[PDB]
């Protein structure tokens, strides 16, 4: 359709306005003294929330250009939460900061490309600095401390996490489920998890968390690309007769007839979810085998002349439960044959011993790790179903926070780590002056989160920032108690991974936006 | 419907406005320091891009006249990319330049026809000059150097290209596919390629590249003109039963019932693509035979009393994969019979020996070349599916750049070749003064690309252009490092074919537009 | 009246707009290829001019704020012409340049006060550099060369100047008058000149040059402050009876009754001009004596009981002619008594010998210099009254240019001196980064005049500037011949004083304007 096109500063003011609406709405919720945000609902009474992610989700602007600015920052900042399990609001606050001052410099005549180089440099060094400031979290004592901190100081949740991680490894697969009573339960089970999410977002099940749970599903393993439902109908019918849901693990499901029907048609009659087989090339085939033996099912491969038209229920595998999300599939309890699973693990173990290269060995043992590793299932018990459900949420949150913590450590929370590394980089320079202001732009932006936090406290942000900067190490301001001190000792910290992801993604969009000369959108 | 008609300068200002919007939007992305362009999407978050071809694709204007101007330049400039595999944005920048100054002269009272003759002359001589400035790229060392340069200095990609080209000829057919693992693979296979594109653009498949891939398709060869689906339904049903896609190679498919249903109806149920048989007259029939034997299928000819109503699956040929685009069809792995294929090649080889004219011999051997030539398939391997997919793109790009390079050599990139040849033509003259300004208009326009590139660098374009022009040979400005030097040594070059196609097509529309006196369009 | 008040950037854009109208109108006339400007007149046919001072005089804007911006730059830039006899347009061009980029930086968030400090520093050093680049003009050969150059290469005018200056000193008082015939005449005459201009601009006589000529006027010396006409009427009557004009040299004339009547009433009946007595304190009295003896008149001092009520014609002095302007009064031919004048000069000469301090000696000899110096009168002869009048103008212009040249030398004209000193100051820095951009702002602005000059030539200003900067010494671009070379040898130069005044005044307003936060004006 006829388009509306904007160039330079015109497009600049437009994006800045859309970003400021998004950022200003979301940032009010930042910190222990964060304010509420009311989100209207046609469904009934408005929702009062402090979850900056929920607010962002509702932000859409009327002006096509301004809306483009907001949707850009929203997309990138969301990648932070996906990556580190948190960081979206901080990413938005930083983004707004870098974009605001970056565009000012651009409008002052500075070179966009240089400004971006400077911003990029400061971020590189700053990430190094965060890495240095990081406090590791490896021992079970640490793991529990982080866990309870994330679970709002719940010693029990920390224990659970630490116990699960100890019983399955810090990088092992751990799930959280509803308890059967008062007592918590933990049991490692034959299972597996691979980095492959649902093909269609429309597969989301009851779990509001943006996931899909399937009780006793039938796993269908086919290394073919299923684009049409025709050669799969018989299976679907049989599955339907069983009343059990279905999980389709194929090379890829094309939205021509299969994914089309599986979604558009199966909106209640059946529970079917589809995901891509892990890996590519030959490994894709091997892994499907691992999954097959694990679930006790067989893979349908055209190479062997296997026909989905003849795929009977016995070919389908099964698991106690399966949880799929944006980019992961976890097979919780494979109905596989213990000895068979052990046989494969041994078979692959042998292959590793006779490997002729590092690459082969690596991938080979990654597979045995999955099969031989198992899944640790946490069953959150409580006195009442309400408590149980609430605690379960806490466990899920703490689990993510802790995993991120074991991976890259922990750093002073409250927006102090960012303002810390920034104070160090005061002598950093670049190939030229534009690059230098670029560097300054990033450094000043690193103070935005703390200043926002102190703003919601009704305190003076430039005074607290000035004070925190003058200090050293993990010395900061505790907005909860509104007293200065050692952030780590005060138990106010964030996984270094979320602070890093937040900064990097924020700098990413800020950079793109600062080096954008033209915007194209449909006319109203 | 009632039309709106414009004449002379009125139509002139209209087209100029439509061209300036299109060119200004697209040219911001030119050069190593090219800026970003945001393209709104209703599908979700906007797309931030630097691909001038993507931007152009989105340009549609509200004013009917201005939009005509833009659509004209877009259509011709796109032919450059199709021809040389690149050149569209440069073609647009040049076009804008020639059109801007041409119309000024026209409005000054100069003769449009003369102005165009002058422009046309300058381009003829300039193309000769580019030919002279060209550095050949024939030896495998050169082929690899160009290949890696195109693959962002990836020695491996250059190797691949050179290896493939050596194993199948520099003008042989080479395809790129996904790897089966870490290692790259290369294997010549039974295949063929002819200059015939898809009948309907609506046949475009998953490949966003404006192409269509078909895995294990059934090739239908019919030298009849299929306008109605009736006499083809039985075949379609059988194909459907096989679940395999279909490729229809017929004399021509008419949009009455066949192309209508094949597109409008087959939007998911089946995968059907249609293309015209190669050549015309008797050759059309002969070639279809070649394709038939190659794919192992048989041609349905009304001459022999063949009825499509009775066309069974055994009549249909098959290939491992088929890729069709705007103006080409490539049969990657014909399931033909080795001996049969060899028999035909021999049969035609004999025919060549007993040929009674140059024309006969020529076309005869063009056919044996296709059959006896084979297709070189490159399998891009990598450590991860992401890497593999990214590298594969690089290989595809480098492959096109290199093929263009072997054909017409290579020339100083960065908009330097055009400004070079232009500095030489300073004494060129024509039949008269109007023709002379015509010549000047084109020569000055040849500086547009470099000046744009330098503009995006934040540098002074008239100073760099002045300096580059004063130099000689492949001496230019390296916008990457922002230093002058020998473009070829600095590894900054373009295939002479793209620079040529860009200039010629740009001058084409510029000429038409400059000699346009009336525009007709529907009223709003 | 109710006011309209603006602050910060709002007032910024307003002043910038008013300055751009003023500067853009005036700068079109810059250089040998300067364009014309048409200034409407109700009096008859429009005036076509290239005199940037005339254009500026006509610039008044509708918007009260924008007009304030224009009137500010006009007032300061005019001080340059007053000081060095030229420089107004250059001052305007520079001012526009410094203001344009200064305000950009301010709007970018830079500190106004710092920016101004930087600008001020660059100007200080640059003036030093100009002083160093200066070519002295002292010997009569030089004086003549500069003179003819100013007189459009007229060897005769140069001769005249050099002859006059030699016959009366380089810092002596020289006047230009109409010739009595074909031959030029030059004669030193009993006269004097002091730095005191007319009290009311409404005293301007026939000389359109903004001056007042009085033939055989009666000089009235009164050290009293004349605010009322009452005690002066008798004198005025007597003067009227003589029909001769009158020059009133008093301590000060107050606009209550005297200056009121002398102007508002004497608009044709009499020719009366008034100026303040030179110096202050006791010196004011002494000097009046010198003037008295010089003109042969007597001073009326209340101290001695002198009453203006009784001031007869014999008390009034007389001179062949008197010329008064904005800030100077020149008594051309005092009817004093040779011996009396010689007596005073001797009397003061004695006082100098018995002086007890440097200050006394200095001022004492400044007085004898005036009396004993005399005035050199140049009589411009020609073949026709038209030629005579035209040549006379040339002599007056050349005389001013040359005097400025003897005082501070001469520098490469054509906007080359400014771009020269600027290229040297590339390493200059200040107390901080804002101060640094301030410095850069000034340096870049120093290129504006040459770039404008080359712009009017239809040439590329950034190319010529780049070339001139790369050169060294007085190497520049001759816009007249449009060839590079040694500006001084090519005879293209400006008195160092005008280039200096232009830069300083330009930086003055630019600084004030850049550090202005609020503007107040009446509402429309």
From Swiss-Prot, chains A, B, C:
It comes from the Bacteria. Changing residue 460 to K: Temperature-sensitive lethal mutant. At nonpermissive temperature, the rate of general translation is reduced and a defined group of cytoplasmic proteins are translated but fail to reach native form. It holds the Pfam family Cpn60_TCP1. It catalyses: ATP + H2O + a folded polypeptide = ADP + phosphate + an unfolded polypeptide. The modification N6-acetyllysine is found at residue 116. The modification N6-succinyllysine is found at residues 33, 50, 116, 276, 320, 389. GO terms for biological process: chaperone cofactor-dependent protein refolding; protein folding; protein refolding; response to heat; response to radiation; virion assembly. GO terms for cellular component: cytosol; GroEL-GroES complex; membrane. Its EC number is 5.6.1.7. ATP binds at residues 29-32, 50, 86-90, 414, 478-480, 494. Changing residue 397 to A: Can bind ATP with normal affinity, but is defective in ATPase activity. Binds non-native rhodanese, but cannot release the protein. Keywords: Acetylation, ATP-binding, Chaperone, Cytoplasm, Isomerase, Nucleotide-binding. During the substrate-folding cycle, the two GroEL rings separate for effective substrate binding and chaperonin activity. Ring separation is triggered by ATP binding to the trans ring of the asymmetric GroEL:GroES complex and avoids formation of functionally impaired symmetric GroEL:GroES2 complexes. Activity of the GroEL-GroES chaperonin complex requires Mg-ATP. UMPylation of the chaperone by SelO/YdiU negatively regulates its activity, and may facilitate survival under stress conditions. It is found in: Cytoplasm. Phosphorylated reversibly during heat shock. Its main location: cytoplasm. Gene3D superfamilies: GroEL, GroEL-like equatorial domain, TCP-1-like chaperonin intermediate domain. PANTHER family: 60 KDA HEAT SHOCK PROTEIN, MITOCHONDRIAL. Each subunit is composed of an apical domain that binds non-folded proteins and GroES, an intermediate domain and an equatorial domain that binds ATP and is involved in inter-ring interactions. Forms a large central channel that appears to traverse the entire length of the cylinder with no obstruction. The central channel of GroEL functions as two cavities, one in each ring, that are separated from each other by the crystallographically disordered 23-amino-acid C-terminal segments of the seven subunits. The entry and exit of polypeptide seem to be restricted to the apical end of each ring. Modulating the volume of the GroEL central cavity affects folding speed in accordance with confinement theory. Small proteins fold more rapidly as the size of the cage is gradually reduced to a point where restriction in space slows folding dramatically. For larger proteins, either expanding or reducing cage volume decelerate folding. A stepwise reduction in cage size results in a gradual loss of cell viability. Belongs to the chaperonin (HSP60) family. Together with its co-chaperonin GroES, plays an essential role in assisting protein folding. The GroEL-GroES system forms a nano-cage that allows encapsulation of the non-native substrate proteins and provides a physical environment optimized to promote and accelerate protein folding, probably by preventing aggregation and by entropically destabilizing folding intermediates. Also plays a role in coupling between replication of the F plasmid and cell division of the cell. NCBIfam families: GroEL, PRK00013.1, PRK12849.1, PRK12850.1, PRK12851.1. This is Chaperonin GroEL. The gene is groEL.
């Amino acid at each position: 359709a006829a388009k509306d096109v904007k160039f330079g500063n015109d497009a600049g003011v437009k994006m800045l306005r859309g970003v400021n609406v998004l950022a200003d709405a979301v940032k009010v919720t930042l910190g222990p003294k964060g304010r509420n945000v009311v989100l209207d609902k046609s469904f009934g009474a408005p929702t009062i929330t402090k979850d900056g992610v929920s607010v962002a989700r509702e932000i859409e602007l009327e002006d096509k250009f301004e809306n483009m600015g907001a949707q850009m920052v929203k997309e990138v900042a969301s990648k932070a939460n996906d990556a580190a399990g948190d960081g979206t609001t901080t990413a938005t606050v930083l983004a707004q900061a870098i974009i605001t001052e970056g565009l000012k410099a651009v409008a002052a005549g500075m070179n966009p490309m240089d400004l971006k180089r400077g911003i990029d440099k400061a971020v590189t060094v700053a990430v190094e600095e965060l890495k240095a400031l990081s406090v590791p979290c490896s021992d079970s004592k640490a793991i529990a401390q982080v866990g309870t901190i994330s679970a709002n100081s719940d010693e029990t949740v920390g224990k659970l996490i630490a116990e699960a991680m100890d019983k399955v490894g810090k990088e092992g697969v751990i799930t959280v489920e509803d308890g059967t009573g008062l007592q918590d339960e933990l049991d490692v089970v034959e299972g597996m998890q691979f980095d492959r999410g649902y093909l269609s977002p429309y597969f989301i099940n009851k779990p509001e968390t943006g996931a899909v749970e399937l009780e006793s599903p039938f796993i269908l393993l086919a290394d073919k690309k299923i684009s049409n439902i025709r050669e799969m109908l018989p299976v679907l019918e049989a599955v339907a007769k069983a009343g059990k849901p279905l999980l389709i693990i194929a090379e890829d499901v094309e939205g021509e007839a299969l994914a089309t029907a599986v979604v558009n048609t199966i909106r209640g009659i059946v529970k079917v979810a589809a995901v891509k087989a892990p890996g590519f090339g030959d490994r894709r085939k091997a892994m499907l085998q691992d999954i097959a033996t694990l679930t006790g099912g067989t893979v349908i491969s055209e190479e062997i002349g296997m026909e989905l038209e003849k795929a009977t229920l016995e070919d389908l595998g099964q698991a106690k439960r399966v949880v799929i999300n944006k980019d992961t599939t976890t097979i919780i309890d494979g109905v596989g044959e213990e000895a068979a699973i052990q046989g494969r693990v041994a078979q692959i173990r042998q292959q590793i011993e006779e490997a002729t290269s590092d690459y082969d060995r690596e991938k080979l043992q990654e597979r045995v790790a999955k099969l031989a590793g198992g899944v640790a299932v946490i069953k959150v018990g409580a006195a009442t179903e309400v408590e149980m459900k609430e605690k379960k949420a806490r466990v899920e949150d703490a689990l993510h926070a802790t995993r991120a913590a074991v991976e890259e450590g922990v750093v002073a929370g409250g927006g102090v780590a960012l303002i810390r590394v920034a104070s160090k980089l005061a002598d950093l320079r670049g190939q030229n002056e534009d690059q230098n202001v670029g560097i300054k732009v990033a450094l000043r932006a690193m103070e935005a989160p703390l200043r926002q936090i102190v703003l919601n406290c009704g305190e003076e942000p430039s005074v607290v920032a000035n004070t925190v900067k003058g200090g050293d190490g993990n010395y900061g301001y505790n907005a909860a108690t509104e007293e200065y001190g050692n952030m780590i000792d005060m138990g106010i910290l964030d996984p270094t991974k979320v602070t890093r992801s937040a900064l990097q993604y924020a700098a990413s969009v800020a950079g793109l936006m600062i080096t954008t000369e033209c915007m194209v959108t449909d006319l109203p």
